[PDB]
Symmetry: C2
Subunit: 131 residues, 2 copies
């Protein structure tokens, strides 16, 4: 179709499908969460919605499953047990470190068909469409 956002879902689904084959137990939302926890340990669970793209509900179920698999650990505010702080466990660290090159490689199967200038320009368009 000639619809930009239809072709967008085409590209996004192909990337997701390749991601699923390569990382069957770590989806892109789960991977992004873990990336965001690594470069900000103790990040607030609420601040992790922007840093990972999600809703409060989806992040809650995600973090529960990751907590259930020993990938992350969480601590609460003593004054407001609603707010939570999230860290990556040593097991989660190992999972994340191994997944980064695989994710980069899945990105590269698509980004690699673009020049560095084209990749940068794709990024400025996507950012201009958001802000």
């Amino acid at each position: 179709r000639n619809k930009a956002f239809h072709q967008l879902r085409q590209l996004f689904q192909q990337h997701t499908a390749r991601w699923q084959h390569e990382l069957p137990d770590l989806t892109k939302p789960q991977y992004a969460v873990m990336r965001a926890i690594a470069d900000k340990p103790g990040i607030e669970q609420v601040a992790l919605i922007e840093a990972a793209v999600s809703t409060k509900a989806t992040l809650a179920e995600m973090l529960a499953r990751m907590e259930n698999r020993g990938l992350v650990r969480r601590e609460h505010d003593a004054a407001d047990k609603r707010r939570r702080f999230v860290w990556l466990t040593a097991e989660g660290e190992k999972v994340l470190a191994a997944a980064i090159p695989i994710g980069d490689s899945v990105d590269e199967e698509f980004l690699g068909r673009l020049s560095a200038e084209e990749q940068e320009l794709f990024m400025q368009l996507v950012r201009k469409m958001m802000n």
Copy 2:
């Protein structure tokens, strides 16, 4: 993040969220299916996976729910009851015709921040990354 595909999911989720508010009972996959049935009535259910971006399973559940709401109707091959042909009902026609301007409008909140040349160029990048 500086990751093109992370920002892609950012843009795609914002568009989906606005789509959900405007068309709560017609998701983008459901809308794309209906568009593809309109300009090819009697299309084979299997051929509707490409024309709508989906898996066989997701399309089956989608078409069942749409059939259950009288939006589409289906006929089978007499020699192979597995294969199905899909049409839009008159009620589905009305739903589709009303949804097209709303969808275009949701697309426009993002595409409108781009010049015609920028929109065309975003499309060539997305297509170059797929083929």
